[PDB]
JSON list of C-alpha atoms in Angstrom, two decimals:
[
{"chain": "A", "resi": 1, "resn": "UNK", "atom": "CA", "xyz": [3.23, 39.43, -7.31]},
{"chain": "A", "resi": 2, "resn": "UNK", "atom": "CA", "xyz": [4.64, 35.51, -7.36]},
{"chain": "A", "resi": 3, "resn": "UNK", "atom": "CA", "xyz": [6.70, 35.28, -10.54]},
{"chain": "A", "resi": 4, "resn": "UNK", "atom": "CA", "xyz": [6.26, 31.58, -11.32]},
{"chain": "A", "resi": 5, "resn": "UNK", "atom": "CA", "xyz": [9.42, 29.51, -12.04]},
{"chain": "A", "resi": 6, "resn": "UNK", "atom": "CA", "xyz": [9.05, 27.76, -15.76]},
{"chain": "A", "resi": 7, "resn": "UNK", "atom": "CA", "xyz": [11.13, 25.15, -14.42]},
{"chain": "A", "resi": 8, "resn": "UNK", "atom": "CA", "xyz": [8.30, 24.30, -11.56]},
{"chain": "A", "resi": 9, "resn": "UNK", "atom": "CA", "xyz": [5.57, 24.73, -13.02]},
{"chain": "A", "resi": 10, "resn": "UNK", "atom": "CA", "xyz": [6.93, 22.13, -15.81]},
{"chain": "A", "resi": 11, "resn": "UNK", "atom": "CA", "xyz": [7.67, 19.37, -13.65]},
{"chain": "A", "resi": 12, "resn": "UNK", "atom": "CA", "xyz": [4.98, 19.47, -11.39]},
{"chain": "A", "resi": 13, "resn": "UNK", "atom": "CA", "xyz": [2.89, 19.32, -14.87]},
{"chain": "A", "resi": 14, "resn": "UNK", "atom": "CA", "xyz": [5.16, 16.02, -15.86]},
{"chain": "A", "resi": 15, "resn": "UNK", "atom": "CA", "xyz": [4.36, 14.67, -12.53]},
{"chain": "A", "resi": 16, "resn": "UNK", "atom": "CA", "xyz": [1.22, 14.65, -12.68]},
{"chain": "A", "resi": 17, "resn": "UNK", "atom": "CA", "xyz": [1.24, 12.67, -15.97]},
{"chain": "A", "resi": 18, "resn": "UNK", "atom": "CA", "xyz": [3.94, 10.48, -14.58]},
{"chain": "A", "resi": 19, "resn": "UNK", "atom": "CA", "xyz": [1.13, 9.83, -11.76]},
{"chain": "A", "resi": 20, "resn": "UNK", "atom": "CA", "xyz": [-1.37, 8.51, -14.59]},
{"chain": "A", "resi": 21, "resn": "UNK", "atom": "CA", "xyz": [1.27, 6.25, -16.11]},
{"chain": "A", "resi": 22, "resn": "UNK", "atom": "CA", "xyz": [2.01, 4.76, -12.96]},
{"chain": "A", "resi": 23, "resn": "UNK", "atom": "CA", "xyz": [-1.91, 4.13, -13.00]},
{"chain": "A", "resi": 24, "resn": "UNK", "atom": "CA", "xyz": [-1.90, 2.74, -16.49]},
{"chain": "A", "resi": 25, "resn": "UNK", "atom": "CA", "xyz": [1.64, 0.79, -16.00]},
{"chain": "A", "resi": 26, "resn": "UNK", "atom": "CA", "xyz": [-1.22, -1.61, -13.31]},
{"chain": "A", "resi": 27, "resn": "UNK", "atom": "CA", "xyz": [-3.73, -2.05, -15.92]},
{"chain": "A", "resi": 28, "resn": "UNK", "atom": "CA", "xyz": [-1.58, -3.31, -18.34]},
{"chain": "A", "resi": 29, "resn": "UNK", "atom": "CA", "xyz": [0.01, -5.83, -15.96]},
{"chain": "A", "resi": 30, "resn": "UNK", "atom": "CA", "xyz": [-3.64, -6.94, -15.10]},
{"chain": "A", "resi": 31, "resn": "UNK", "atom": "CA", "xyz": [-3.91, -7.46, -18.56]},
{"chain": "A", "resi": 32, "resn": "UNK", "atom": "CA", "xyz": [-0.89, -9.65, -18.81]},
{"chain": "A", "resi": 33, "resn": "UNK", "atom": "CA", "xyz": [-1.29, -11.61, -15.61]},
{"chain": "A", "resi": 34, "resn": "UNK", "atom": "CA", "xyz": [-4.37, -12.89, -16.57]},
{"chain": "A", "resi": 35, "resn": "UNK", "atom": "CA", "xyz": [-3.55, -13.67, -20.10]},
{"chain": "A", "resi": 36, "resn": "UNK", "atom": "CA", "xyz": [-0.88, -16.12, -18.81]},
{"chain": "A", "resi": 37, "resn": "UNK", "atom": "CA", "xyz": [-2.99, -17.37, -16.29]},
{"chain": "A", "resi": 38, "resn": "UNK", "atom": "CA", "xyz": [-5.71, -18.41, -18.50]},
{"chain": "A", "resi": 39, "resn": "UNK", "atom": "CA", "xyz": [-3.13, -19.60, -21.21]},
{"chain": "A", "resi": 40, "resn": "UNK", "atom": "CA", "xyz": [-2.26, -21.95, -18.91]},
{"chain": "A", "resi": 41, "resn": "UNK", "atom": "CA", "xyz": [-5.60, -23.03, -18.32]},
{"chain": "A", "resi": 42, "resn": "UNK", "atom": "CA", "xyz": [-5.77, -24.28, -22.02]},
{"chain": "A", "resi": 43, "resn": "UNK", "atom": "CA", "xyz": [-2.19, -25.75, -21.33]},
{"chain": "A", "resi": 44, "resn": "UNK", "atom": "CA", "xyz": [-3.63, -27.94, -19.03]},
{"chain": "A", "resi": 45, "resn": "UNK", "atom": "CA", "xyz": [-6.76, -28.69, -20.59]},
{"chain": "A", "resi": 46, "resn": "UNK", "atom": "CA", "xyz": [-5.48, -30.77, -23.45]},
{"chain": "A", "resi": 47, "resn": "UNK", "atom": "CA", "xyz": [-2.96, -32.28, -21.22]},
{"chain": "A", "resi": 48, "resn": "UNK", "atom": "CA", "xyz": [-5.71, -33.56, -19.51]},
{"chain": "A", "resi": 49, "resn": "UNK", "atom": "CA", "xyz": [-6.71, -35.14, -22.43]},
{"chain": "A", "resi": 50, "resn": "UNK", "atom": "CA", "xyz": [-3.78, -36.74, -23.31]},
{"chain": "A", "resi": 51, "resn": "UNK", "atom": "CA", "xyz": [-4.23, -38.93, -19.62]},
{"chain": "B", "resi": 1, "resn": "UNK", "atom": "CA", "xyz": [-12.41, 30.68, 1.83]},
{"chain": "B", "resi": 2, "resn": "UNK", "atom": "CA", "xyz": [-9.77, 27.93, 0.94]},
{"chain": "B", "resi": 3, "resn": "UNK", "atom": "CA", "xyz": [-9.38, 27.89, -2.58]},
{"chain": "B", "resi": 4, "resn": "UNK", "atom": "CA", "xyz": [-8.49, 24.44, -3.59]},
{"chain": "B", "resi": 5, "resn": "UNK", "atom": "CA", "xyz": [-5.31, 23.50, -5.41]},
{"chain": "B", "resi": 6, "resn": "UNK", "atom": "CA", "xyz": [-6.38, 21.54, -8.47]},
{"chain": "B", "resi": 7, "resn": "UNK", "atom": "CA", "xyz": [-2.91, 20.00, -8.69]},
{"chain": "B", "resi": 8, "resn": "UNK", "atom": "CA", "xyz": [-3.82, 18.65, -5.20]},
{"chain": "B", "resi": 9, "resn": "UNK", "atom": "CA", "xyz": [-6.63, 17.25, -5.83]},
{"chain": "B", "resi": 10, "resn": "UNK", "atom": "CA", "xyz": [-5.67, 15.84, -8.84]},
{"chain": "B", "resi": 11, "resn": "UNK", "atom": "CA", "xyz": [-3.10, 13.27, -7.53]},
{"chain": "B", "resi": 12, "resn": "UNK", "atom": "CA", "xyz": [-5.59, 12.42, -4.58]},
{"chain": "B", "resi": 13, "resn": "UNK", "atom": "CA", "xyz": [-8.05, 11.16, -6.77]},
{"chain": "B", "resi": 14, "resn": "UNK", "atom": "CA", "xyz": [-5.22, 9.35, -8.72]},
{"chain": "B", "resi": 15, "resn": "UNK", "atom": "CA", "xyz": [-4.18, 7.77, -5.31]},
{"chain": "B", "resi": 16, "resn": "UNK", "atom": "CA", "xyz": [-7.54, 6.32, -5.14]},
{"chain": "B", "resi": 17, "resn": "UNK", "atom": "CA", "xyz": [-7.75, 5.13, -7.93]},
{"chain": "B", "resi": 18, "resn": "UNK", "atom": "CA", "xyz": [-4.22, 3.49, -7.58]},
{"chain": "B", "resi": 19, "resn": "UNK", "atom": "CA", "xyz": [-4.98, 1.51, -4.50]},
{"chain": "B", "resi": 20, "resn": "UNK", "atom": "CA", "xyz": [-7.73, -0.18, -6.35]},
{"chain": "B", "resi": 21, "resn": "UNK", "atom": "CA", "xyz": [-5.23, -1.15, -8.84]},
{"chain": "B", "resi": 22, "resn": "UNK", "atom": "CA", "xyz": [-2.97, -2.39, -6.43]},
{"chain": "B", "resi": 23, "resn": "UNK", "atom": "CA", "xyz": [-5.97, -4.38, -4.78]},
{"chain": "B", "resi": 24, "resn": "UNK", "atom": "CA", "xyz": [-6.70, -6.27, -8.03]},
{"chain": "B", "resi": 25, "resn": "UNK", "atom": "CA", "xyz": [-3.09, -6.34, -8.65]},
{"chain": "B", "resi": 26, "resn": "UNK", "atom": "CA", "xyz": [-3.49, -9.12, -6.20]},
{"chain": "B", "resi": 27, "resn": "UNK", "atom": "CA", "xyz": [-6.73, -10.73, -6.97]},
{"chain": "B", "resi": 28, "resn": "UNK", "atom": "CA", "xyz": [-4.88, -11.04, -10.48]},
{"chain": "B", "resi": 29, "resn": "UNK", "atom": "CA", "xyz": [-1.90, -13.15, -9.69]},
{"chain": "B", "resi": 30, "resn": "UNK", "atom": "CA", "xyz": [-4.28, -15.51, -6.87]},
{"chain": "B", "resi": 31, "resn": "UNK", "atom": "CA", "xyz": [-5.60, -16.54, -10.49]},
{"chain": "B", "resi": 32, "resn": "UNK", "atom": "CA", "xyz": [-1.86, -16.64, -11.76]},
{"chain": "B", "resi": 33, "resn": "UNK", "atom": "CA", "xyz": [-0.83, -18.78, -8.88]},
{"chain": "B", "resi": 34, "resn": "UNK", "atom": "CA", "xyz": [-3.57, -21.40, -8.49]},
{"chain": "B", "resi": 35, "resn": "UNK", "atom": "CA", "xyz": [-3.79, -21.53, -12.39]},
{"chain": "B", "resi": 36, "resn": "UNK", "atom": "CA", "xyz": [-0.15, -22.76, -12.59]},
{"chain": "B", "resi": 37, "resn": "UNK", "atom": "CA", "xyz": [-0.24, -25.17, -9.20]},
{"chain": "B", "resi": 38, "resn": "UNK", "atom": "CA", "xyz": [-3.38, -26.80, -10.87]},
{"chain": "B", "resi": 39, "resn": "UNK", "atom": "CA", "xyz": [-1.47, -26.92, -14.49]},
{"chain": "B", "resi": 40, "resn": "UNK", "atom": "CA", "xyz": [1.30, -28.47, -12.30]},
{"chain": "B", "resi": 41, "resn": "UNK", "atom": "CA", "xyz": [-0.99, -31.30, -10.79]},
{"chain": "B", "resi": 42, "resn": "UNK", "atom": "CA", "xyz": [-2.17, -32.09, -14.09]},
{"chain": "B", "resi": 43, "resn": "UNK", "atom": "CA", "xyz": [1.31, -32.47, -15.60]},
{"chain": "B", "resi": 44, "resn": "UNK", "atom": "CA", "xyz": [1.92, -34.67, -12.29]},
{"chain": "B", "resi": 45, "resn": "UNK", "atom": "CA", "xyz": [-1.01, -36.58, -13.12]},
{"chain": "B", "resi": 46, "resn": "UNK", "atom": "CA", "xyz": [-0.17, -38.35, -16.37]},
{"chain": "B", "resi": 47, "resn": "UNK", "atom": "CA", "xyz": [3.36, -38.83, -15.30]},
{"chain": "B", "resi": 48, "resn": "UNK", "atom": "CA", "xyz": [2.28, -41.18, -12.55]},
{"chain": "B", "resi": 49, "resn": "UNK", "atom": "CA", "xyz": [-0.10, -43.14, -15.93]},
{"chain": "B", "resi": 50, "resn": "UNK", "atom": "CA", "xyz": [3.38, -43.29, -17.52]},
{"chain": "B", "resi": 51, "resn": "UNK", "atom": "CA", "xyz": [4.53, -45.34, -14.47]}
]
């Protein structure tokens, strides 16, 4: 019978959270990226204005 | 019968998943970079009024 290692089995558990994360460190920079985009859509709306 | 290995597939689904990311990472900063060139044009704009 395979004895399992408790070491193995424990990072192969971490890495597939560390796979998600990597998946949810995107969506959060999507997040951002867009925020600053638009913010400097207002920016440049009122400056606009100002001409 | 293969018995599959629900580590395996798992991360493959996260993999698709993650090149959609990384697909709108992209479509994300196109709005980042033509919302900041077009800021810039306004900024460029007035300054020229000032003249």
């Amino acid at each position: 019978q395979p004895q399992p290692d408790p070491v193995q089995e424990q990072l192969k558990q971490l890495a597939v959270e560390k796979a998600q994360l990597e998946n949810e460190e995107l969506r959060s920079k999507i997040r951002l990226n867009d925020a600053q985009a638009q913010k400097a859509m207002a920016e440049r709306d009122n400056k606009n204005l100002d001409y």
